[PDB]
Design a protein around this motif. Structure first.
Motif, PDB file in Angstrom:
ATOM      1  N   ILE A  33      71.084  58.311 -53.663  1.00 47.81           N
ATOM      2  CA  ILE A  33      70.636  59.223 -52.618  1.00 47.81           C
ATOM      3  C   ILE A  33      70.956  60.678 -52.953  1.00 47.81           C
ATOM      4  N   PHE A  34      72.132  60.982 -53.513  1.00 52.16           N
ATOM      5  CA  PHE A  34      72.522  62.385 -53.635  1.00 52.16           C
ATOM      6  C   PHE A  34      72.713  62.888 -55.063  1.00 52.16           C
ATOM      7  N   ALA A  35      72.917  61.992 -56.032  1.00 55.92           N
ATOM      8  CA  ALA A  35      73.190  62.400 -57.405  1.00 55.92           C
ATOM      9  C   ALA A  35      72.060  63.244 -57.977  1.00 55.92           C
ATOM     10  N   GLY A  36      70.811  62.897 -57.661  1.00 61.59           N
ATOM     11  CA  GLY A  36      69.697  63.680 -58.175  1.00 61.59           C
ATOM     12  C   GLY A  36      69.805  65.146 -57.806  1.00 61.59           C
ATOM     13  N   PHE A  37      70.009  65.419 -56.517  1.00 57.61           N
ATOM     14  CA  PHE A  37      70.198  66.789 -56.055  1.00 57.61           C
ATOM     15  C   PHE A  37      71.399  67.435 -56.729  1.00 57.61           C
ATOM     16  N   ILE A  38      72.542  66.740 -56.739  1.00 64.38           N
ATOM     17  CA  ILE A  38      73.763  67.341 -57.277  1.00 64.38           C
ATOM     18  C   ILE A  38      73.579  67.716 -58.746  1.00 64.38           C
ATOM     19  N   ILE A  39      73.107  66.763 -59.549  1.00 63.66           N
ATOM     20  CA  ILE A  39      72.945  66.978 -60.983  1.00 63.66           C
ATOM     21  C   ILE A  39      71.935  68.084 -61.250  1.00 63.66           C
ATOM     22  N   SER A  40      70.770  68.022 -60.596  1.00 64.47           N
ATOM     23  CA  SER A  40      69.743  69.026 -60.851  1.00 64.47           C
ATOM     24  C   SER A  40      70.222  70.419 -60.465  1.00 64.47           C
ATOM     25  N   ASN A  41      70.945  70.535 -59.350  1.00 53.74           N
ATOM     26  CA  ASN A  41      71.437  71.827 -58.904  1.00 53.74           C
ATOM     27  C   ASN A  41      72.660  72.303 -59.673  1.00 53.74           C
ATOM     28  N   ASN A  42      73.295  71.439 -60.463  1.00 55.54           N
ATOM     29  CA  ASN A  42      74.461  71.845 -61.235  1.00 55.54           C
ATOM     30  C   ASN A  42      74.145  72.170 -62.689  1.00 55.54           C
ATOM     31  N   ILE A  43      73.297  71.381 -63.346  1.00 52.85           N
ATOM     32  CA  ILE A  43      73.035  71.601 -64.774  1.00 52.85           C
ATOM     33  C   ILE A  43      72.373  72.958 -64.971  1.00 52.85           C
ATOM     34  N   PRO A  44      72.696  73.693 -66.031  1.00 49.11           N
ATOM     35  CA  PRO A  44      72.041  74.984 -66.281  1.00 49.11           C
ATOM     36  C   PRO A  44      70.555  74.804 -66.533  1.00 49.11           C
ATOM     37  N   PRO A  45      69.732  75.769 -66.122  1.00 53.02           N
ATOM     38  CA  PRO A  45      68.291  75.672 -66.383  1.00 53.02           C
ATOM     39  C   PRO A  45      67.998  75.653 -67.876  1.00 53.02           C
ATOM     40  N   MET A  46      67.210  74.663 -68.293  1.00 51.27           N
ATOM     41  CA  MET A  46      66.845  74.499 -69.691  1.00 51.27           C
ATOM     42  C   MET A  46      65.346  74.387 -69.923  1.00 51.27           C
ATOM     43  N   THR A  47      64.542  74.221 -68.874  1.00 50.28           N
ATOM     44  CA  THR A  47      63.098  74.081 -68.998  1.00 50.28           C
ATOM     45  C   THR A  47      62.415  75.072 -68.072  1.00 50.28           C
ATOM     46  N   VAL A  48      61.472  75.830 -68.615  1.00 50.18           N
ATOM     47  CA  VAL A  48      60.711  76.783 -67.798  1.00 50.18           C
ATOM     48  C   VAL A  48      59.784  76.011 -66.862  1.00 50.18           C
ATOM     49  N   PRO A  49      59.838  76.251 -65.555  1.00 53.52           N
ATOM     50  CA  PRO A  49      59.028  75.464 -64.619  1.00 53.52           C
ATOM     51  C   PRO A  49      57.585  75.938 -64.541  1.00 53.52           C
ATOM     52  N   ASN A  50      56.720  75.016 -64.118  1.00 59.06           N
ATOM     53  CA  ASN A  50      55.305  75.306 -63.876  1.00 59.06           C
ATOM     54  C   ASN A  50      55.116  75.732 -62.418  1.00 59.06           C
ATOM     55  N   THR A  51      55.582  76.947 -62.132  1.00 64.30           N
ATOM     56  CA  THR A  51      55.586  77.510 -60.784  1.00 64.30           C
ATOM     57  C   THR A  51      54.218  77.462 -60.110  1.00 64.30           C
ATOM     58  N   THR A  52      53.230  78.140 -60.691  1.00 64.48           N
ATOM     59  CA  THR A  52      51.885  78.145 -60.134  1.00 64.48           C
ATOM     60  C   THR A  52      51.110  76.937 -60.645  1.00 64.48           C
ATOM     61  N   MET A  53      50.562  76.158 -59.713  1.00 56.33           N
ATOM     62  CA  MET A  53      49.912  74.898 -60.016  1.00 56.33           C
ATOM     63  C   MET A  53      48.894  74.604 -58.928  1.00 56.33           C
ATOM     64  N   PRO A  54      47.749  74.014 -59.266  1.00 55.70           N
ATOM     65  CA  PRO A  54      46.836  73.533 -58.226  1.00 55.70           C
ATOM     66  C   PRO A  54      47.549  72.575 -57.283  1.00 55.70           C
ATOM     67  N   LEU A  55      47.283  72.731 -55.983  1.00 61.69           N
ATOM     68  CA  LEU A  55      48.010  71.961 -54.978  1.00 61.69           C
ATOM     69  C   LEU A  55      47.817  70.462 -55.174  1.00 61.69           C
ATOM     70  N   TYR A  56      46.584  70.032 -55.454  1.00 55.09           N
ATOM     71  CA  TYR A  56      46.339  68.609 -55.662  1.00 55.09           C
ATOM     72  C   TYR A  56      47.114  68.092 -56.866  1.00 55.09           C
TER      73      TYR A  56
END
Lengths: 303, 177, 459, 85, 66, 126, 12, 117, 153, 77, 169, 111, 122
Positions: A219-242
């Motif tokens: 339930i919570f490890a995903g949030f904790i780990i993702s919010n703790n590890i340093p950013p390593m991948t550039v996100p695809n911010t703008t994306m078609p909604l579908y």
């Protein structure tokens, strides 16, 4: 099966590829090969899982599909995402396997889902655990699945990728919800089909505590780990909604269609097997012809 | 198990097909109510040709039903967990230790269970005493050209034990643990 | 070197004058002491070989083999105690003396400085081995097996004798040191080609090469347990040692003449391992596995790269230990069931757990489980062959697969499954048998800690 | 939870009682299905299937075809489950 | 340890702690989902609008008049 | 549809026409087979249930099988054209094939070495 | 009921 | 969409992603100012930023890394810094989208010039 | 000695003696064809795996599903339950092979087609500073790279 | 000893087995094992939730906790 | 202890800690606990053993071999001089191998230390290893398992002849 | 069904089998061969915190002490043994030599 | 950084203690599975410490404690690459194994060789 062939041993190959990510990024053919291979595994394993009558077999095929998804992620040149998926999969799939083991133990070595029924209320704790784990496996938002799989699908869609590999990944995502619906409807839901002399009892401190620990993780490890590890991948911010919602849309489609077919199973209409059903249920015939012809030829030649 | 036969009668073959067909149908019909409905329909099909007397006709029908069974065979039929092909089949086979190993135990190990081994000696004596009669009895009841069936005779007279009984009587328990 | 040779000789009068109740005890004691003494030779110099005298010398190739032989003798005595327990005192002493003579001969072979002296002793090893196989064998095929082994080895050796004498006449000396310092390249003339063949074929026969390996199955299967131990632990390595020594004066003709033998061995490993897959006799399976593992060493020697030689030495030591252990385990099972059919005895794991653990560890070493010295040698040879040709990896990996398959198959068939019901004479494992297995396994696992010792002089 | 001979007998007679074709009043431990009752061969196969599903162990056909007396079924189950009490 | 007694043809005994823990963890999962979505929905929905080609003009893009 | 049997997928008895033959000769043959089986079983049981017997019950069939698989191979061997052809094509065929492949690869690498094209920047271990 | 478990001799 | 307009449509007028950029940057646009890099090479190396992440939004990411390092133990005290970084990345991806359509309209216009001639 | 496998039976009398030796009916007994392969007079038993044998029948050797004295198949080791299985399959062998190979081939062909027509987003290539990180990506510092200038759009 | 319950109590009445029995009666057949399978469709086992209902387990309490937590933040902010 | 010239380690640049959150860093407390409960007793034991060593202070020396005439300055059959020269050559071979190892250690340490900037911050180490590799390969490669000083001499002579031919063209 | 002889034999075998199974039952006692090590030391020693802490000590404190001590023989002794990744420097101050750097900034439109 | 190396090595070393103790009476007693579980739990707690240090700073190191053998120019040494992947995966794997071991203690309770089973898991 829950420890080695669900969370540690099976991820070894993906870990090997991830460890050599600086080298893998240099070459291009290898990335495409990994992508195509992973797509094939996801599609085939999930398709087989749809028509498996053994609960452990379904869970194992789900593990194989997940590993193939990680291999596809490697094909998108996204190693850190694959490692994150490895962690989340280790968190929830092991819990799913433990719940299956609890079901088997309570039902006196009954691994065939056809003879398992009415387990929703008989085993509430393992039912809750299985529900949460399956939802996470299908990438339920704000769960361990959401913080890895959804990102993986997003990356695959928003990348220069072999078209058919992407298609196979998306189709596989629906099949993921399908086999989850299978292991929910035919086991926990419905009327009891297990033999008489009910000995169902999950009131064991060890089982409860272990599944509880894995529940809190799922339930919570995903949030904790993702919010703790340093950013390593550039996100695809703008994306078609579908495209952004595609993962959830495909999951909902799979859930609905699987539940529809399960409801039609209730209908008093016996029908002979289709050739496609035979193909899927026989594991694509691969363990039949590819386990008899080569072995026979080799041993006969040797003698 | 039970002594095998030289052949299966046409009646026996149909009964075997009947059990297989119902079990495969039960595998197809996951829900119990669905299975019970189609079980009677399949049973009726057997009842329809229950009156069938012509053996050639009955044999022809049997061939067709088996062909139909193969075409309608469940690719992954349900097998009982401890049944051959089941998930738990032969699971506890390794834990099954032959009783003759107990005689190889060190005196210290036999001292740990004195009463049991003392009773075990009684069983050993019983086997030796009755063994001669067992072989003799078999010869008396053996046909001239040896036995044609594997079936064994019981103890005709009191004080004798069924010939060839030690292994069957002293076989390992299902769950040694 | 006489610090090892003289006690080995003194074993013989001791065994002959030991009391009938103390023969085995005295032999084992002093053999273990001799192995302890031989351990000193492992302190090899970085460059120069330990030239003890004009006649005896040792290097980082000879010393591991010497230690192996001196260590193998006591275990052979321990194994031979069982079956040779109803023998008369004189014949038991005779068997012990044959073993001691074999050990002495092998020590002198591995330490001989003169090539002709090495030839003399390495062909002298035939006599004790032949006597052991033919006299104390249990089957009726022992005579034919001894004939095959003796005639194969002699047919290989006699041209080697002629070639060695020719070299002595031309070069002037057969001392390894002089032969190495005064090395001269061989031309491609037919005379040189036939000289190379004469110098290589004998050692090719000694370490079973596909096509000339027919003697090994017969010899290993028919011979008594101790005889099989030496045959598969040292006598095969004799070929490798001699070939590595003699290749010094066989270059650059080796580059042209290796292809036939190289291809023969590279296909032979696969063929023999596949034969192992479908074997019905336990000892025969072990022998064929030995054939494959030795074909690996043959390839390594032929390639003549430093990594290949290091891996060859490591593999030789590792295989010696593993094959001896496997034969000992098969001997224990055979003594209990009085048959060598693999399918006869099943589910022995339930009846004998500790021996099953020994089986597991031995099979793991046979399949080269990292970081066992077996894997070290195999991987070094694989890398050297990959440098020679990238295509080699195909056959090498396939051979690894087949080795793992047949080793685990042996373990499953013997130490797994439903126990055979009628076999009721399987008694608990004796302390001696377990000690034998331990004295086979523990040294190998310890050797993994410091592989440098068994990595040869090219380390 | 070891099945006892009496418990096995109780479950066997329970399954027979739930069978409408078997009238419970005359249902006895020695009621031969082919002689005392009117069950035919298909009924014998059906009752064998019911017993094996209730106890969760497959009964071999060669053994099943020769199990008619209810006590015979009970004792066969006892042997298979190693029940001595 | 015979705390739970086996039944024959009835639903099994369900202890209070079992039900309490099951319901608590299921509600915890649902609450976590709702709490995260209320705190942040962009992860599911979106953070920045996707631009369109028609929005940009030829001069804005830099395409010169034919 | 129907089921087509293969070497690795035999035809089941239920679909086997021979199973349904109820002729008298076939019944007698089945009786004879059962008789042989019963005789062998009786002998094995008598030895197996004998309290005095302490050892392995020798199985002649196993001995014959092991002998035929190894011992009797050569004595029955005849140099037929089929045997000679197959023996040649599986004995020296693969050897020649592998020799050709390896020789070609080695010569290619040597050519690249001679012209210096082959890359050996850090190939200092061989 | 404590039942005797047939095992191989473990003393050796 | 654009794939169908290139795989089943006019591939000649549809921009090839690998070929892009094809038309010269000065062509069409009267004048284009170059993009400015906030961070310096040495700064990127000091932060040990991944080469994939060393893009025109590296400054925001570096500030994010700095705050995250300082924010620890709290891992939820850099949302604003993260927002700034992904906003820049949003603009960069928008710019790339414009580059695609810039080539797109130019390709059709190129055909229009062919039609004119 | 006479209970050991012999040469290929030539006279019917030899065939009967061989049948008796292997404890097989004279009618059932069939030697391997005299092809000179060294089979001899050993019976050519049906090529069916031990798994096919009735699992409910009481075998003298349960794991191998064999009886004592019963003639042993020449390739028994290959046909053990742990190895090659020749049991009947629900779908016919030809159909199973066709479906498997067809599925694999279709997957491969469609993946090749997908490579022909890949999936990509309608965006330009991503731009990096400092001449596409020339120096950062192991670029010769002495050799000045070709200018890579990215303009604002 | 487990108290084997009454055998008469098992009745197809209401259970889908009865609906099957009615269908078989229309065909002229009678299901012979209706009471044997009654326990499956009887007792607490008879009532089971649907797939959507099962997935929403705890949502009511979770949503209540969510609403309370949302209100708690506003009062504390 | 070791020569930093042989094993160059760039001066460490640890940033100063500047906490911006009130929450206390768990790492700091954990490190303090670890220091007090582990480093302190370990250091005390080390000090005691160091005292014991200081009492029994003895020295071991490094053996140095004088230069010996090379195989080039050696007669055709002069086995004594040949043995001397061959031993010298083998010693030099070992030394060269160890030099290669040292440079490799430098390269690996650079790869780890520079992290993501390893490609741009290890150019010097890569160049050094490339040089050493080239030299070692040219001097000692393809000699064979039975390598000898005469073999290196032959390889060098062949190389020199090829160089002469190239320079003449 | 069962032939009368077969049925009778089954009955007799069942009787003997059940006798054998009853024989396979442990006697009221299973004589346990005669704990000086577990006498006064294990008489009534602390069974909660002492046990938990002694397990903790022997399994972590001793190993951690030994390994941290091995660092004194390993990292301090041999060069390039424990190589730490150079700490990432974000514009700020260092420790050994201090010093600070700060880049330019762009316009900040919104959060 | 010093505690980072110490803790990272200690986790793996502590994991080996049950295997060593498999030669003692604890293996024969029924406490062995519980000892295994507690060892794994303590090792997971220890693994959390390097994870926290890495989260705070990003510390990544390689520890070549022991040199196996130097093959001419190739040196082989036991080296533990403690980086993001390893430093994060070790806690996850240990936690999962802890839960699995508790479940095994329940599920494999009747297994005759449960101690062997736990030893194999370790």
């Amino acid at each position: 099966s829950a420890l080695l062939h669900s969370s540690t041993m099976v991820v070894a190959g993906v870990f090997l590829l991830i460890r050599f990510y600086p080298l893998m990024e240099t070459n291009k053919l290898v990335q495409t090969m990994t992508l195509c291979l992973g797509a094939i595994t996801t599609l085939f394993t999930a398709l087989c899982a749809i028509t498996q009558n053994d609960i452990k077999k379904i869970v194992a095929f789900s593990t194989s599909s997940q590993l193939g998804l990680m291999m596809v992620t490697i094909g998108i040149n996204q190693p850190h995402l694959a490692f994150l998926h490895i962690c989340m999969h280790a968190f929830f799939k092991a819990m799913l396997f433990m719940c299956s083991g609890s079901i088997i133990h309570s039902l006196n070595d009954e691994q065939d889902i056809r003879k398992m029924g009415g387990l929703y209320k008989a085993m509430p704790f393992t039912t809750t655990a299985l529900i949460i784990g399956s939802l996470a496996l299908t990438g339920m938002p704000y769960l361990t699945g959401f913080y890895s799989k959804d990102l993986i699908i997003e990356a695959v869609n928003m990348s220069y990728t072999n078209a058919w590999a992407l298609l196979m990944t998306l189709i596989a995502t629906s099949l993921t919800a399908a086999y989850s619906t299978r292991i929910i409807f035919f086991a926990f839901l419905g009327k009891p089909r297990f033999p008489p002399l009910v000995l169902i009892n999950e009131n064991n401190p060890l089982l409860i505590n272990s599944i509880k620990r894995l529940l809190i993780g799922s339930i919570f490890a995903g949030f904790i780990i993702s919010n703790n590890i340093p950013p390593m991948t550039v996100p695809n911010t703008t994306m078609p909604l579908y495209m952004k919602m595609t993962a959830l849309i495909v999951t909902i489609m799979g859930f609905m269609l699987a539940l529809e077919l399960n409801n039609t199973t209730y209908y008093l209409k016996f029908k002979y097997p289709s050739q496609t059903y035979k193909f899927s249920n026989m594991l694509g015939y691969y363990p039949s012809i590819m386990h008899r012809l080569p072995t026979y030829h080799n041993l006969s030649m040797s003698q | 198990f039970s002594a095998p036969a030289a052949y299966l009668t046409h009646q026996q073959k149909v009964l075997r097909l009947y059990k297989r067909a119902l079990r495969h149908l039960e595998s197809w019909c996951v829900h119990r109510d669905k299975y019970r409905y189609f079980a009677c329909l399949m049973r009726a099909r057997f009842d329809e040709h229950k009156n069938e007397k012509d053996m050639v006709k009955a044999t022809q029908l049997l061939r067709q039903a088996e062909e139909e069974f193969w075409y309608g065979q469940h690719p992954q039929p349900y097998i009982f967990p401890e049944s051959p092909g089941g998930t738990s089949y032969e699971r506890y086979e390794c834990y099954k230790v032959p009783e003759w190993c107990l005689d190889d135990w060190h005196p210290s190990e036999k001292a740990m269970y004195p009463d049991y081994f003392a009773k075990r000696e009684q069983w050993k004596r019983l086997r030796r005493e009755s063994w001669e009669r067992e072989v003799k009895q078999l010869q008396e009841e053996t046909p001239p050209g040896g036995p044609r069936t594997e079936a064994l005779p019981p103890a005709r007279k009191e004080g004798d034990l069924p010939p060839l009984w030690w292994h069957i009587v002293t076989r390992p328990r299902e769950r040694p643990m | 070197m006489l610090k090892i040779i003289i006690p080995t000789t003194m074993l013989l009068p001791m065994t002959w004058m030991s009391k009938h109740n103390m023969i085995w005890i005295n032999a084992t004691v002093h053999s273990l002491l001799i192995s302890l003494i031989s351990l000193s030779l492992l302190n090899q110099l970085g460059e120069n070989s330990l030239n003890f005298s004009l006649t005896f010398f040792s290097d980082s190739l000879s010393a591991p083999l010497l230690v192996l032989t001196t260590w193998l003798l006591p275990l052979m005595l321990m194994a031979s105690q069982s079956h040779l327990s109803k023998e008369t005192t004189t014949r038991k002493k005779l068997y012990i003396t044959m073993l001691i003579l074999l050990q002495l001969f092998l020590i002198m072979t591995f330490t001989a400085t003169e090539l002709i002296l090495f030839y003399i002793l390495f062909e002298a090893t035939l006599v004790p081995t032949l006597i052991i196989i033919t006299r104390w064998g249990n089957q009726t095929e022992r005579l034919n097996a001894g004939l095959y082994f003796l005639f194969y080895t002699l047919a290989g050796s006699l041209p080697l004798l002629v070639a060695l004498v020719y070299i002595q006449n031309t070069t002037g000396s057969l001392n390894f040191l002089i032969i190495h310092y005064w090395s001269h390249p061989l031309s491609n003339s037919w005379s040189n080609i036939f000289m190379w063949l004469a110098c290589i074929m004998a050692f090719m026969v000694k370490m079973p090469l596909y096509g000339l390996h027919l003697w090994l199955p017969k010899a290993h299967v028919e011979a008594p347990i101790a005889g099989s131990m030496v045959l598969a632990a040292v006598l095969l390595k004799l070929g490798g040692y001699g070939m590595m020594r003699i290749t010094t004066i066989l270059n650059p003709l080796t580059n042209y003449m290796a292809y036939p033998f190289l291809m023969l061995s590279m296909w032979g490993m696969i063929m023999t391992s596949s034969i192992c897959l479908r074997q019905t006799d336990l000892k025969s399976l072990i022998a064929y596995s030995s054939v494959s593992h030795m074909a690996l060493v043959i390839v390594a020697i032929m390639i003549q790269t430093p990594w290949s030689f290091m891996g060859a030495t490591a593999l030789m030591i590792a295989h010696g230990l593993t094959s001896s252990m496997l034969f000992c385990l098969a001997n224990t099972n055979y003594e209990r069931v009085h048959s060598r059919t693999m399918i006869l005895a099943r589910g022995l794991q339930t009846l004998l757990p500790l021996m099953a653990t020994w089986w597991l560890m031995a099979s793991l070493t046979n399949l080269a489980l990292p970081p066992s010295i077996n894997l070290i040698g195999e991987l070094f040879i694989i890398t050297a062959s990959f440098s020679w040709s990238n295509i080699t990896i195909i056959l090498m990996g396939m051979n690894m697969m087949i080795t793992a398959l047949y080793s685990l198959y042996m373990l499953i068939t013997t130490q797994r499954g439903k126990y055979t019901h009628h076999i009721n004479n399987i008694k608990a494992s004796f302390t001696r048998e377990n000690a034998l297995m331990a004295l086979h396994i523990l040294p190998l696992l310890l050797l993994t800690l410091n592989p440098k010792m068994i990595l040869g002089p090219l380390y | 939870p070891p099945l006892t001979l009496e418990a096995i007998k109780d479950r066997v007679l329970y399954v027979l009682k739930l069978y409408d074709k078997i009238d419970p009043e005359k249902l006895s431990v020695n009621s031969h299905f082919m002689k005392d009752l009117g069950l035919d061969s298909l009924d014998q196969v059906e009752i064998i299937m019911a017993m094996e599903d209730e106890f969760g162990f497959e009964i071999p056909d060669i053994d099943a075809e020769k199990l008619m007396c209810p006590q015979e079924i009970v004792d066969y189950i006892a042997d298979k489950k190693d029940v001595y009490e | 340890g015979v705390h739970i007694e086996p039944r024959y043809r009835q639903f099994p005994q369900l202890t209070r702690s079992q039900l309490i823990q099951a319901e608590f963890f299921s509600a915890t999962m649902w609450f976590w989902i709702l709490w995260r979505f209320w705190h942040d929905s962009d992860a599911v929905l979106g953070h920045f609008p996707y631009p369109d080609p028609s929005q940009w003009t030829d001069e804005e893009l830099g395409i010169l008049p034919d | 549809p129907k089921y087509k049997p293969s070497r690795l997928a035999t035809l089941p008895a239920t679909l086997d026409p021979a199973e349904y033959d109820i002729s008298p000769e076939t019944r007698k043959a089945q009786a004879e087979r059962l008789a042989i089986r019963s005789r062998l079983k009786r002998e094995y049981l008598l030895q197996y249930n004998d309290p005095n017997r302490l050892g392995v019950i020798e199985d002649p069939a196993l001995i014959r099988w092991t002998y035929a698989r190894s011992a009797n191979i050569y004595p029955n061997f005849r140099p037929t054209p089929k045997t000679s052809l197959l023996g040649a094509l599986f004995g020296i065929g693969p050897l020649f094939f592998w020799y050709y492949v390896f020789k070609t690869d080695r010569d290619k690498k040597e050519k690249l070495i001679q012209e210096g094209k082959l890359d050996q920047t850090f190939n200092i271990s061989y | 009921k404590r039942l005797f478990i047939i095992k191989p001799s473990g003393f050796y | 969409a654009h794939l169908a307009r290139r795989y089943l449509g006019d591939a000649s007028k549809e921009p090839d992603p690998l070929r892009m950029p094809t038309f010269p940057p000065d062509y069409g646009f009267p004048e284009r100012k170059e993009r400015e890099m906030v961070a310096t090479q040495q700064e990127m190396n000091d932060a040990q930023l991944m080469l994939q992440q060393r893009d025109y939004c590296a400054h925001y990411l570096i500030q994010l890394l700095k705050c995250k390092r300082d924010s620890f133990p709290n891992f939820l005290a850099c949302k604003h810094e993260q927002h700034d970084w992904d906003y820049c990345e949003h603009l960069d991806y928008v710019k790339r989208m414009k580059e695609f359509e810039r080539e797109r309209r130019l390709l059709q216009r190129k055909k229009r010039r062919e039609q004119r001639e | 000695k006479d209970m050991f496998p012999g040469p290929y039976p030539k006279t019917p009398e030899e065939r009967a003696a061989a049948a008796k030796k292997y404890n097989m009916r004279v009618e059932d007994y069939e030697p391997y064809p005299d092809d000179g392969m060294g089979y001899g007079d050993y019976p050519k038993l049906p090529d069916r795996s031990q798994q096919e044998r009735d699992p409910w029948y009481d075998w003298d050797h349960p794991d191998l599903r064999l009886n004592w004295g019963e003639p042993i198949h020449w390739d028994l080791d290959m046909y053990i339950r742990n190895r090659v299985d020749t049991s009947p399959t629900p779908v016919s062998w030809n159909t199973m092979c066709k479906h498997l190979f067809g599925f694999v081939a279709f997957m491969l062909f469609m993946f090749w087609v997908g490579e022909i027509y890949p999936s990509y987003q309608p965006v330009g290539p991503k731009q990096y500073p400092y001449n596409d990180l020339y120096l950062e990506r192991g670029g010769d510092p002495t050799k000045e790279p070709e200018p890579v200038v990215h303009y604002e759009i | 000893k487990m108290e084997l319950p009454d055998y008469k109590q098992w009745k197809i009445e209401g259970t889908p087995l009865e609906t099957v029995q009615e269908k078989l009666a229309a065909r002229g057949l009678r299901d012979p094992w209706g009471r044997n399978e009654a326990w499956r469709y009887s007792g607490g086992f008879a009532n089971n939730v649907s797939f959507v209902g099962a997935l929403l387990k705890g949502f009511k309490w979770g949503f209540a906790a969510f609403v309370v937590a949302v209100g708690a933040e506003y009062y504390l902010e | 202890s070791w020569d930093k010239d042989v094993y160059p380690e760039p001066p460490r640049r640890t940033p100063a800690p500047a906490p911006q959150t009130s929450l206390p860093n768990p790492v700091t407390y954990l490190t303090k606990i670890f220091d007090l409960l582990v480093d302190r007793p370990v250091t005390l034991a080390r000090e005691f053993i160091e005292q014991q060593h200081a009492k029994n202070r003895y020295y071991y020396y490094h053996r140095e071999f004088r230069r010996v005439p090379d195989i080039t300055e050696c007669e055709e059959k002069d086995i004594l001089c040949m043995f001397e020269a061959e031993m010298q050559w083998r010693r030099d071979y070992k030394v060269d191998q160890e030099i290669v190892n040292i440079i490799q250690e430098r390269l690996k340490a650079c790869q780890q230390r520079e992290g993501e900037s390893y490609r741009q911050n290890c150019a010097k180490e890569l160049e050094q290893f490339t040089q050493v590799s080239k030299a070692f390969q040219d001097r000692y490669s393809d000699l064979g398992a039975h390598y000898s000083a005469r073999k290196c001499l032959a390889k060098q002579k062949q190389r020199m002849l090829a160089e002469r031919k190239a320079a003449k063209e | 069904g069962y032939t009368p002889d077969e049925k009778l034999r089954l009955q007799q075998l069942r009787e003997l089998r059940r006798r054998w199974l009853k024989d396979q039952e442990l006697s009221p006692r299973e004589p346990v061969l005669p704990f000086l090590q577990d006498g006064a030391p294990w008489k009534n020693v602390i069974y909660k915190t002492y046990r938990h802490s002694i397990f903790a000590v022997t399994h972590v404190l001793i190993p951690v002490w030994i390994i941290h001590y091995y660092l004194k023989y390993h990292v301090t002794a041999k060069p390039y043994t424990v190589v730490e990744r150079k700490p990432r420097i974000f514009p700020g101050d260092t420790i050994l030599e201090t010093g600070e750097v700060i880049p330019l900034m762009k316009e900040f439109p919104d959060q | 950084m010093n505690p980072f190396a110490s803790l990272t090595l200690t986790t793996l070393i502590i994991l080996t203690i049950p295997i060593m103790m498999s030669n003692s009476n604890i293996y024969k007693t029924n406490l062995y599975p519980n000892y295994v579980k507690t060892t794994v739990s303590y090792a997971f707690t220890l693994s959390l410490v390097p994870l926290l240090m890495f989260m705070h700073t990003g510390q990544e190191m390689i520890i070549s404690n022991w040199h196996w053998m130097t093959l001419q120019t190739v040196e082989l040494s036991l080296s533990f690459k403690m980086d993001y992947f390893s430093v994060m995966f070790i806690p996850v794997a240990l936690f999962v194994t802890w839960s699995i071991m508790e479940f095994s203690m329940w599920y494999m309770h009747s297994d005759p060789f449960i101690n062997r089973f736990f030893k194999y898991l370790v």
